[PDB]
Subunit: 120 residues, 4 copies
């Protein structure tokens, strides 16, 4: 379907399995993909009929900054839940939470989770 | 299908919901993807069997520069439509309209809208 | 399963407008050939998979050693010769990229991408 | 189907058909994706129902650095293979083994092989 994106959002967060992670913190990135209809929006030009990009960002920030989890799997899952719940026009969404600097000994760009949630 | 592409067209436009995005303006980017058959163009090596990539660029430039809308949706929608209407050789198209510097307090690369259209 | 060569850069003199044919410009090719790789991945054998080096060479040949009006015909003659010389290739996808075309404006690149198979 | 990614792991190894590639060595890069349900991980916040991203790194490194094959097809095959053996919770995977500086006389970014491997 049609799609709103927010590419490579960046937060500082305290999330992790290790208590050393909890204390120090690290970078956390999020990519978002949400699906709806944009034919109406595009034939109209009135934001009242699509989902507001600025609110979708804020939502993401609350989960990554205003709350702490052990797993990036819980960041992704919460984001997805608040999305579908708060926004009834969005059908599907793919959400990817990225830990560019995890505490692993080796050479790499990033580890990440990605889920894709839908209304039953 | 086979695909023609234009990658990362960059414009300056004055689009936006708030009046201040219309005053100041901002960068807008557009990725173009159009679906058609290029087997004929390939074995012929003759441009009339394909679509001119310049005319495509120009067509989008007109939408992003010569007009102004509240919504990127609306930019995506007019491009898809003006491609389909003007080009019958094209079955299907995908247009993505990127705002890289929207006024959101935060840290992000970009926001965007992608639509895929057909007759 | 899949084999890849990414961002092959060549200098060629392709194009519709006769000035492009004297000046020339950059041409990039993304190659993407499909098959099964279970055979080679257990045997550890270049017999049971495709030579990546030859695939580059074939692309080099079509982009550097001949000239066409269209990028679509670079793409075609590559995809046709891949399916000619390599039976075990189920399918292929060629994306030919013109990064510096003579369009007055600001973009990264224009491009064709075909997918061919027997 | 949900996914754990590991992007652009970098190793130095001595893989190659040519005996010269075998003596000198060169860079090798690996991308990993693995499919599994992460909905329970995302509610419980419990790593046991998911899979350690770190152990995944190590699995890949064993193959690239502790062993030496003639082909990159072999590298991705054993990786996929070893993933499927050890982790029942993982349904499928995709492995891209990249060779960024292969001995091809020309101009290019990288050559590579991607495979996808599932269980019965
Ligand atoms: C090892 N490790 C630490 N935190 C983790 C997380 O959120 N997910 C996974 N899969 N592994 C983790
Ligand atoms: C908040 N906001 C402002 N302009 C917008 C647009 O074009 N699309 C969406 N989804 N949100 C917008
Ligand atoms: C305008 N133009 C010049 N060369 C071209 C090509 O190969 N394809 C298309 N579609 N347009 C071209
Ligand atoms: C030509 N060539 C040299 N080494 C190679 C390797 O490891 N794989 C493939 N497919 N080709 C190679």
């Amino acid at each position: 379907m049609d799609k709103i994106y927010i590419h490579d959002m960046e937060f500082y967060g305290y999330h992790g399995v290790f208590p050393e992670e909890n204390k120090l913190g690290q970078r956390f990135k999020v990519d978002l993909t949400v699906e709806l209809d944009l034919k109406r929006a595009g034939e109209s030009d009135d934001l009242e009929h699509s989902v507001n990009y600025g609110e979708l960002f804020e939502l993401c920030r609350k989960v990554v900054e205003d709350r702490t989890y052990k797993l990036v799997e819980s960041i992704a899952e919460n984001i997805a839940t608040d999305i579908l719940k708060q926004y009834e026009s969005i059908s599907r969404c793919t959400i990817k939470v990225i830990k560019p600097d995890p505490p692993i000994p080796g050479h790499y760009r990033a580890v990440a989770v990605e889920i894709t949630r839908e209304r039953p």
